[PDB]
Motif scaffolding. Structure first.
Motif, PDB file in Angstrom:
ATOM      1  N   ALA A 167       0.844  -1.200   0.000  1.00  0.00           N
ATOM      2  CA  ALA A 167       0.000   0.000   0.000  1.00  0.00           C
ATOM      3  C   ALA A 167       0.879   1.250   0.000  1.00  0.00           C
ATOM      4  O   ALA A 167       0.641   2.168  -0.773  1.00  0.00           O
ATOM      5  N   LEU A 168       1.909   1.291   0.844  1.00  0.00           N
ATOM      6  CA  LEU A 168       2.769   2.461   0.850  1.00  0.00           C
ATOM      7  C   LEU A 168       3.370   2.738  -0.543  1.00  0.00           C
ATOM      8  O   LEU A 168       3.355   3.880  -1.015  1.00  0.00           O
ATOM      9  N   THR A 169       3.898   1.715  -1.207  1.00  0.00           N
ATOM     10  CA  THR A 169       4.499   1.955  -2.516  1.00  0.00           C
ATOM     11  C   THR A 169       3.407   2.369  -3.500  1.00  0.00           C
ATOM     12  O   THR A 169       3.553   3.353  -4.184  1.00  0.00           O
ATOM     13  N   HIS A 170       2.290   1.642  -3.516  1.00  0.00           N
ATOM     14  CA  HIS A 170       1.139   2.003  -4.334  1.00  0.00           C
ATOM     15  C   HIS A 170       0.639   3.448  -4.144  1.00  0.00           C
ATOM     16  O   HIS A 170       0.226   4.096  -5.123  1.00  0.00           O
ATOM     17  N   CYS A 171       0.680   3.945  -2.910  1.00  0.00           N
ATOM     18  CA  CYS A 171      -0.025   5.163  -2.556  1.00  0.00           C
ATOM     19  C   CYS A 171       0.834   6.381  -2.270  1.00  0.00           C
ATOM     20  O   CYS A 171       0.316   7.430  -1.881  1.00  0.00           O
ATOM     21  N   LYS A 172       2.138   6.235  -2.450  1.00  0.00           N
ATOM     22  CA  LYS A 172       3.105   7.247  -2.020  1.00  0.00           C
ATOM     23  C   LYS A 172       2.985   8.601  -2.744  1.00  0.00           C
ATOM     24  O   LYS A 172       3.400   9.620  -2.199  1.00  0.00           O
ATOM     25  N   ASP A 173       2.447   8.628  -3.959  1.00  0.00           N
ATOM     26  CA  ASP A 173       2.287   9.920  -4.654  1.00  0.00           C
ATOM     27  C   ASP A 173       0.977  10.647  -4.355  1.00  0.00           C
ATOM     28  O   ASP A 173       0.793  11.792  -4.790  1.00  0.00           O
ATOM     29  N   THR A 174       0.075  10.000  -3.614  1.00  0.00           N
ATOM     30  CA  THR A 174      -1.247  10.595  -3.364  1.00  0.00           C
ATOM     31  C   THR A 174      -1.155  12.010  -2.781  1.00  0.00           C
ATOM     32  O   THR A 174      -1.843  12.919  -3.238  1.00  0.00           O
ATOM     33  N   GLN A 175      -0.292  12.206  -1.789  1.00  0.00           N
ATOM     34  CA  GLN A 175      -0.235  13.493  -1.112  1.00  0.00           C
ATOM     35  C   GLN A 175       0.144  14.691  -2.004  1.00  0.00           C
ATOM     36  O   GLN A 175      -0.130  15.845  -1.654  1.00  0.00           O
ATOM     37  N   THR A 176       0.767  14.418  -3.146  1.00  0.00           N
ATOM     38  CA  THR A 176       1.263  15.484  -3.995  1.00  0.00           C
ATOM     39  C   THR A 176       0.113  16.272  -4.643  1.00  0.00           C
ATOM     40  O   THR A 176       0.307  17.419  -5.045  1.00  0.00           O
ATOM     41  N   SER A 177      -1.084  15.678  -4.695  1.00  0.00           N
ATOM     42  CA  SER A 177      -2.284  16.379  -5.202  1.00  0.00           C
ATOM     43  C   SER A 177      -2.923  17.329  -4.174  1.00  0.00           C
ATOM     44  O   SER A 177      -3.897  18.005  -4.483  1.00  0.00           O
ATOM     45  N   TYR A 178      -2.380  17.374  -2.962  1.00  0.00           N
ATOM     46  CA  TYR A 178      -2.948  18.168  -1.869  1.00  0.00           C
ATOM     47  C   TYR A 178      -1.937  19.067  -1.186  1.00  0.00           C
ATOM     48  O   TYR A 178      -0.785  18.677  -1.000  1.00  0.00           O
ATOM     49  N   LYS A 179      -2.390  20.249  -0.769  1.00  0.00           N
ATOM     50  CA  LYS A 179      -1.539  21.197  -0.063  1.00  0.00           C
ATOM     51  C   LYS A 179      -1.729  21.147   1.442  1.00  0.00           C
ATOM     52  O   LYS A 179      -0.751  21.150   2.183  1.00  0.00           O
ATOM     53  N   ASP A 180      -2.987  21.111   1.882  1.00  0.00           N
ATOM     54  CA  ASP A 180      -3.321  21.044   3.308  1.00  0.00           C
ATOM     55  C   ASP A 180      -2.823  19.713   3.924  1.00  0.00           C
ATOM     56  O   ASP A 180      -3.005  18.658   3.332  1.00  0.00           O
ATOM     57  N   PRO A 181      -2.143  19.770   5.091  1.00  0.00           N
ATOM     58  CA  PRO A 181      -1.596  18.554   5.712  1.00  0.00           C
ATOM     59  C   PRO A 181      -2.664  17.529   6.142  1.00  0.00           C
ATOM     60  O   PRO A 181      -2.384  16.338   6.122  1.00  0.00           O
ATOM     61  N   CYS A 182      -3.857  17.973   6.528  1.00  0.00           N
ATOM     62  CA  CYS A 182      -4.958  17.048   6.888  1.00  0.00           C
ATOM     63  C   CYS A 182      -5.450  16.284   5.647  1.00  0.00           C
ATOM     64  O   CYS A 182      -5.762  15.081   5.717  1.00  0.00           O
ATOM     65  N   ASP A 183      -5.518  16.972   4.506  1.00  0.00           N
ATOM     66  CA  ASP A 183      -5.827  16.307   3.244  1.00  0.00           C
ATOM     67  C   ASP A 183      -4.701  15.319   2.813  1.00  0.00           C
ATOM     68  O   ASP A 183      -5.002  14.211   2.366  1.00  0.00           O
ATOM     69  N   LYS A 184      -3.422  15.721   2.931  1.00  0.00           N
ATOM     70  CA  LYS A 184      -2.305  14.800   2.593  1.00  0.00           C
ATOM     71  C   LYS A 184      -2.431  13.480   3.380  1.00  0.00           C
ATOM     72  O   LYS A 184      -2.326  12.387   2.822  1.00  0.00           O
ATOM     73  N   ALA A 185      -2.650  13.613   4.684  1.00  0.00           N
ATOM     74  CA  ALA A 185      -2.707  12.465   5.595  1.00  0.00           C
ATOM     75  C   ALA A 185      -3.932  11.616   5.292  1.00  0.00           C
ATOM     76  O   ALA A 185      -3.819  10.383   5.150  1.00  0.00           O
ATOM     77  N   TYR A 186      -5.089  12.261   5.230  1.00  0.00           N
ATOM     78  CA  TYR A 186      -6.345  11.504   5.096  1.00  0.00           C
ATOM     79  C   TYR A 186      -6.415  10.794   3.750  1.00  0.00           C
ATOM     80  O   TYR A 186      -6.853   9.646   3.669  1.00  0.00           O
ATOM     81  N   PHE A 187      -6.067  11.503   2.688  1.00  0.00           N
ATOM     82  CA  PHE A 187      -6.264  10.918   1.347  1.00  0.00           C
ATOM     83  C   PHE A 187      -5.188   9.903   1.016  1.00  0.00           C
ATOM     84  O   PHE A 187      -5.437   8.990   0.220  1.00  0.00           O
ATOM     85  N   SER A 188      -4.027  10.021   1.661  1.00  0.00           N
ATOM     86  CA  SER A 188      -3.023   8.937   1.574  1.00  0.00           C
ATOM     87  C   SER A 188      -3.519   7.660   2.251  1.00  0.00           C
ATOM     88  O   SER A 188      -3.331   6.544   1.741  1.00  0.00           O
ATOM     89  N   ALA A 189      -4.184   7.827   3.390  1.00  0.00           N
ATOM     90  CA  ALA A 189      -4.728   6.695   4.116  1.00  0.00           C
ATOM     91  C   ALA A 189      -5.940   6.132   3.368  1.00  0.00           C
ATOM     92  O   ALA A 189      -6.103   4.910   3.318  1.00  0.00           O
ATOM     93  N   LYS A 190      -6.763   6.989   2.770  1.00  0.00           N
ATOM     94  CA  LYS A 190      -7.851   6.495   1.892  1.00  0.00           C
ATOM     95  C   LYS A 190      -7.368   5.664   0.699  1.00  0.00           C
ATOM     96  O   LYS A 190      -7.922   4.594   0.435  1.00  0.00           O
ATOM     97  N   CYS A 191      -6.369   6.170  -0.022  1.00  0.00           N
ATOM     98  CA  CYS A 191      -5.689   5.394  -1.101  1.00  0.00           C
ATOM     99  C   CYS A 191      -5.267   4.002  -0.624  1.00  0.00           C
ATOM    100  O   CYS A 191      -5.494   3.016  -1.315  1.00  0.00           O
ATOM    101  N   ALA A 192      -4.652   3.923   0.560  1.00  0.00           N
ATOM    102  CA  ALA A 192      -4.259   2.650   1.172  1.00  0.00           C
ATOM    103  C   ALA A 192      -5.466   1.759   1.468  1.00  0.00           C
ATOM    104  O   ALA A 192      -5.436   0.573   1.132  1.00  0.00           O
TER     105      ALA A 192
END
Ligand code: NA
Ligand code: NA
Ligand code: NA
Ligand code: NA
Length: 125
Positions: A89-114
């Motif tokens: 999941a980490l390798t699969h999802c590692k670029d997710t945060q780059t679509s977001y600026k807000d740190p709560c969005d980076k965290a949440y949507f990375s975990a959603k991708c996983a």
């Protein structure tokens, strides 16, 4: 590494530490434990997820998700029932945060991708 029961105990403590700070309710929290993440959560749920990743030492001062300490965490800490799902999941999802600026969005949507990538047995605190 931790056993599944030890990991659950650790995840319940993290949730106890973070959930009271945020306007979240039991159902949506039970949902994330069962790897069901809404596509459009309210902000309080997104920041709950950030609080959690921060607590697990997976977040940076920049407000970003840290690949390197996540890997070290997964290696040292996770039981076999979770460990291989988490690495993939980490390798699969590692670029997710780059679509977001807000740190709560980076965290949440990375975990959603996983959550979305893995089966329903992949737990989040
Ligand atoms: Na153990
Ligand atoms: Na998705
Ligand atoms: Na999942
Ligand atoms: Na899934």
């Amino acid at each position: 590494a931790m056993t599944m029961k030890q990991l659950t105990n650790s995840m319940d403590m993290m949730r106890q530490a973070c959930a009271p700070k945020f306007k979240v309710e039991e159902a949506e929290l039970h949902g994330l434990r069962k790897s069901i993440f809404p596509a459009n959560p309210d902000k309080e749920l997104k920041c709950y997820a950030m609080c959690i990743a921060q607590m697990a030492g997976t977040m940076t001062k920049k407000g970003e998700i840290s690949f390197s300490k996540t890997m070290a965490q997964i290696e040292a800490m996770l039981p076999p029932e979770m460990k291989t799902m988490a690495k993939e999941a980490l390798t699969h999802c590692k670029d997710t945060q780059t679509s977001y600026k807000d740190p709560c969005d980076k965290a949440y949507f990375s975990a959603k991708c996983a959550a979305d990538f893995t089966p329903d047995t992949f737990m989040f605190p």
